[PDB]
Design a protein around this ligand. Structure first.
Ligand code: ZN
Lengths: 192, 94, 61, 114, 187
RNA sequence: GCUCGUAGUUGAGCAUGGAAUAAUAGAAUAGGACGUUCUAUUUUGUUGGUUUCUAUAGGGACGGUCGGGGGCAUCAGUAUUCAAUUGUCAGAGGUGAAAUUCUUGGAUUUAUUGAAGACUAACUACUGCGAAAGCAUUUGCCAAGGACGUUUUCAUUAAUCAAGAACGAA
């Protein structure tokens, strides 16, 4: 019985998130079509990402719809045969589909934000803590792309997680970082 | 017991110490084919095949210690895969 | 064509069910020849084209 | 892919363990392989951003188990098995705390409070 | 010793006792690598076996393993071997067998463990082809921790077959051609 | 008794069978016609189909499972002992046989009711769960777990463990 109740709760959460994502997608593509009609040309994906971030910052409603319409008229907006006709219409539809895919990717970037919004809605319907600390930031000569590309064993060979321990003394951490930050060793690991 | 058994019949009612089943399998069973459960344990063998083509029934010859009154409606009875033969055989050839 | 008497081993709770059962046995049917018949006993399909229940006595079974 | 880094930062601020962040990013982005995002890489990214966990994840889960067992034993004083598993859990906590102090992941002054 | 690993070892020993009739004291054969590792790491081998088996232990060695121990010329290993009680193998003194092959000749008779031995060896493929033999418990010392190997597939199959025959034995024992006139050749 | 754990140490279906005869096929011995082959006696078998289907340790996380594991309420049932009302009448109990006892003031047996301290018949268990002690009536609540699979910020995390501590016994 508990397994059945858990499955029903999971299904309800999934369909609520689906409804929220479809509502955001259709509202965003409507305001994007209006902004494209006013602008008269194609809109950059950076403006769509900024609009998605603005709609993520403030809770969406009719007042937030008016705010999004004002932001579509803001200073950021001002800063920015027959078979052939059918093919051009199909290309315009494909461009609209690509814009919708970009909006879907933006919503996928805020997918856990949508899950948090759904959790807040569920809490409204109903109505310890893992703590981190700030430390000295060292990238150790590696950007995030090369961290993601490298293997876990290769990264552990480069430097261990216990080397930059949160409470290790600064002398030993500096001594390890000096040896790691050698250009020859970094080049050898990159070749490896 | 065979490793793979397929669901063959559903309990209908007892009849004179035999178990009547509506067939929940598309194919026809072999005569005297053993009838199993999900536990792979034999309850008996197929005694008689009867009924129309759309609605096939079969009666099971119950073994020792297996009583027809002990089973209830909705019980499923299982048969081995090699003990089924296609219904096209009994129909006349074109 | 046949006119046949069936004897039931027990009295039916519902009379009309007998007729319904006869209506279930009309059509193409799976039959095996009995032990007394000289024909080899293999499962065949035999068609009953039309059947009609003339009478039924549930007390006489 | 600086956006990925900013959800790492935000989801570390709001209190998720690196394994939870990993499973969340693998579910959200539709990552094909678990090799691409692991807890280790999230630790490296967090250290690159000046973030580091105060206590380790497994010791945090042991402390969570101990808190649940002590609450149950407070509401049920007659359960001797609860006391036995509480002693076992606290022994595991003491062993991991000694190890993590030894490798300097935990501070030297760190005491488990019962 | 933790309670979970002790419980798992007790369950495996119950499997060995019910199916293969192992009885306390357990008869354990040791190998020469184990003797060397217990010498260097200063591990008390009979105490470790008594802890792992949770019962009385009787320790044995063969000619070939202790012969290789004299070949290593370690006085402490020879002394540690010679505290254990002696069980002879029928092999040539001038040309002794390899310790793995010798310990299999002692243990593996006709594909079964006839003498009910327990093998405590460090060598690995020896342990593989002793997993092929059913009902042979395997123990090894890794990183100063003495570990009993899990139950092999052959032992589980033997136990299942033994329970199956328990269900039907013991007290449950019941105790052409056509007629010549039909096929006729032409005139 | 069990577990944790300090000092120290180590590593890190159509009527059955027998006898004789006939027919058919094979194998032997011996012979003809020109090594081939057929031709006389012995021996070995056999006696057509279809009725239309036709013929490494110690921890952590996640997933799906699982248990007579623990505690607290709750609901029944079973058998004893005691007591109170009937009916009946000379024994009941126990043993190798007796005996101590209860008994016309009614013992034992039967029926009904009340009280008390307990246990959960068969299924059912040397292999299930639990660190041990121990653990099967129903329904709820609480926390904990084993095995399997996928793995881990994963070893100065482990193993032996005097002291000491929790449970049990007492
Ligand atoms: Zn030898």
């Amino acid at each position: 019985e508990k397994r059945k109740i858990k499955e029903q709760i999971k299904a309800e959460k999934e369909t609520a998130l689906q409804k929220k994502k479809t509502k955001k997608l259709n509202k965003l593509t409507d305001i994007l079509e209006q902004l494209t009609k006013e602008y008269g040309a194609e809109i950059n994906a950076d403006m769509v990402k900024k609009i998605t971030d603005t709609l993520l910052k403030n809770d969406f409603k009719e007042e937030e719809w008016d705010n999004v319409v004002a932001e579509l008229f803001n200073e950021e907006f001002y800063q920015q045969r027959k078979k052939s006709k059918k093919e051009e219409k199909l290309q315009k539809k494909k461009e609209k589909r690509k814009v919708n895919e970009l909006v879907e990717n933006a919503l996928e970037q805020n997918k856990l934000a949508l899950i948090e919004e759904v959790e807040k809605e569920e809490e409204e319907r109903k109505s310890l803590k893992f703590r981190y600390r700030e430390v000295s930031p060292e990238s150790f000569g590696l950007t995030a792309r090369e961290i993601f590309a490298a293997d876990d064993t290769d990264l552990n060979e480069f430097i261990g997680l216990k080397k930059f321990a949160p409470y290790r003394s600064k002398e030993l951490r500096a001594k390890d970082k000096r040896k790691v930050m050698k250009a020859r060793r970094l080049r050898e690991w990159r070749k490896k | 017991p065979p490793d793979t058994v397929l669901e063959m019949g559903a309990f209908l009612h007892p009849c004179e110490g035999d178990i009547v089943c509506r067939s929940i399998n598309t194919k026809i069973p072999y005569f005297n084919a053993p009838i199993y459960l999900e536990n792979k344990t034999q309850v008996g063998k197929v005694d008689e095949i009867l009924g129309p083509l759309n609605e096939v029934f079969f009666t099971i010859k119950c073994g020792d210690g297996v009583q027809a009154t002990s089973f209830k409606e909705g019980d499923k009875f299982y048969i081995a895969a090699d003990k089924l033969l296609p219904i096209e055989r009994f129909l006349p050839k074109p | 064509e046949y006119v046949c008497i069936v004897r039931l081993h027990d009295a039916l709770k519902d009379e009309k069910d007998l007729g319904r059962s006869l209506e279930n046995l009309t059509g193409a049917l799976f039959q095996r020849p009995p032990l007394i018949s000289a024909v080899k006993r293999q499962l065949r399909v035999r068609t009953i084209y039309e059947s009609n229940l003339i009478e039924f006595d549930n007390k006489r079974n | 892919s600086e956006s990925v880094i900013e959800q790492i930062v935000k989801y570390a601020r709001k209190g998720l363990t690196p394994s939870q962040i990993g499973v969340l990013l693998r579910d959200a982005h539709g990552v094909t392989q678990a090799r691409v995002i692991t807890g280790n890489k999230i630790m490296r990214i967090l250290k690159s951003n000046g973030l580091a966990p105060e206590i380790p994840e497994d010791l945090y889960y042991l402390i969570k188990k101990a808190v649940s067992v002590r609450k149950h034993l407070e509401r049920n004083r007659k359960d001797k098995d609860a006391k036995f598993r509480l002693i076992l859990i606290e022994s595991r906590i003491h062993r991991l705390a000694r190890y993590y102090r030894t490798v300097a992941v935990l501070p030297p002054n760190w005491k488990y409070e019962s | 010793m933790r309670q979970k690993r002790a419980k798992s070892y007790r369950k495996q020993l119950l499997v060995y006792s019910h199916t293969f009739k192992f009885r306390e004291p357990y008869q354990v054969l040791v190998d020469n690598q184990l003797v060397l590792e217990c010498n260097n790491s200063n591990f008390n081998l009979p105490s470790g076996l008594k802890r792992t088996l949770q019962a009385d232990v009787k320790v044995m060695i063969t000619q070939c393993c202790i012969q290789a121990l004299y070949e290593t010329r370690n006085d402490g290993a020879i002394n540690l071997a010679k505290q254990f009680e002696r069980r002879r193998c029928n092999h040539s003194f001038k040309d002794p067998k390899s310790p793995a092959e010798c310990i299999e000749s002692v243990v593996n008779i006709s594909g079964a463990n006839k003498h009910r031995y327990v093998v405590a060896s460090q060598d690995i493929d020896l342990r593989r082809k002793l997993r092929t033999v059913p009902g042979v418990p395997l123990i090894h010392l890794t990183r100063s921790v003495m570990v009993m190997e899990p139950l092999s597939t052959a032992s589980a199959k033997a136990s299942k077959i033994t329970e199956e025959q328990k269900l039907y034995k013991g007290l449950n024992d019941p105790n052409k051609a056509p007629n010549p006139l039909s096929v006729k050749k032409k005139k």
